[PDB]
Design a protein around this ligand. Structure first.
Ligand code: SAH
Ligand code: ARS
Length: 330
């Protein structure tokens, strides 16, 4: 019904999740994973938008390690006061519990984290911004995405899970608070998403995972007849030199190990240890300016060879976003 792990949980996250307070997991309902299984998180500052009971906040906590930091934001006392419960519990995980926790919880609206109350979230403080089945619920999406842009460091990354549509919803369906409350009503047409995040400073969206979402309950399915709701997990890097098109300047880039046998960046790129792999300029700028430069040697720009076609799905790479997400999902 939208808000439920609409894919399997990744392996590494399971080991952890076992150890997460069961209360936090009874409650909790987002479409799939909003946190990489890269291994790329040690020492990061992660912010969660609409964190609720803090499932993702506490999973991030273990992932970042004792010396990274997590900040869940949520608008509701009732959701926050549940997650605050287990700060100390989950400090066992770091051995020295009642003291060793990274996490903290701010109360505020995600469209404005500068007024989040315990304390605000200043400009350029965050490495990763996550969210699990929450952004579809915003009222001013452009405002939200700009806000996210204000708060990431340069080379930082919006990496998040949310529910998206085949097509714009009818004027009617927009209004229905039942539909909206099931995290379907507010969901975005994939092409309007891309348009917005770009309007807001993110010109390069990359799709990690797509999930079938089905309304079944036909009291709803009437207002959205031919719609096909999705659950997509998207990374958008904050990097000033990205263009809206994946141009090719001759560069390869090579994963050096440190994490696993291979680093998998998106559906299109998989760098295994010490094997160079050709990339478009954006993909290079991402690696260079993000936290990734440390596991990554990256060739120099050369001559422009027009649109990047060095990939075996290059056709699709350049396709609209709707088409990308029909083809994966089939
Ligand atoms: N405009 C807004 N500002 C801040 N938080 C919001 C919001 N609209 C909805 N939320 C929060 O969004 C959450 C949707 S439920 C998802 C909670 C969490 N991501 C999980 O998977 O458990 C709720 O906890 C709600 O409090
Ligand atoms: As939801």
């Amino acid at each position: 019904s939208a808000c439920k792990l609409a894919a399997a949980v990744p392996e590494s996250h399971r080991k952890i999740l076992a150890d997460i307070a069961d209360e936090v997991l009874e409650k909790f309902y987002g479409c799939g994973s909003t946190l990489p299984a890269d291994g790329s998180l040690e020492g990061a500052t992660v912010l969660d938008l609409g964190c609720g009971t803090g499932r993702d906040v506490y999973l991030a906590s273990k992932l970042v390690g004792e010396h990274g930091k997590v900040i869940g934001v949520d608008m509701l006392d009732n959701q926050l006061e549940v997650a605050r419960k287990y700060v100390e519990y989950h400090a066992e995980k770091f051995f020295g519990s009642p003291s060793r926790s990274n996490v903290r919880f701010l109360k505020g609206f995600i469209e404005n984290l500068a007024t989040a109350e315990p304390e605000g979230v200043p400009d350029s403080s965050v490495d990763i911004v996550i969210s699990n089945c929450v952004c579809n619920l915003s009222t001013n999406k452009l405002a939200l995405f700009k806000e996210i842009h204000r708060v990431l460091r340069d080379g930082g990354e919006l990496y998040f899970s949310d529910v998206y549509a085949d097509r714009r919803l009818s004027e009617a369906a927009q209004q229905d608070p039942i539909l909206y409350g099931e995290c379907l009503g507010g969901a975005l047409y994939l092409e309007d998403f891309r348009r917005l995040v770009a309007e807001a400073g993110f010109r390069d969206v990359r799709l990690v995972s797509v999930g079938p979402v089905d309304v079944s309950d036909p009291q709803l399915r009437k207002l959205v007849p031919d719609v096909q709701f999705y659950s997509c997990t998207f990374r958008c890097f904050k990097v000033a030199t990205l263009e809206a098109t994946r141009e090719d300047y001759g560069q390869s880039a090579t994963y050096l190990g440190g994490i696993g046998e291979e680093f998998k960046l998106d559906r299109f790129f998989t760098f295994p240890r010490e094997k160079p792999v050709r990339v478009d300029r954006n993909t290079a700028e991402i690696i260079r300016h993000s936290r990734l430069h440390q596991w990554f040697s990256v060739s120099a720009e050369q001559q422009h060879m027009g649109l990047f076609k060095a990939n075996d799905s290059y056709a699709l790479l350049h396709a609209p976003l709707s088409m990308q997400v029909e083809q994966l999902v089939s």
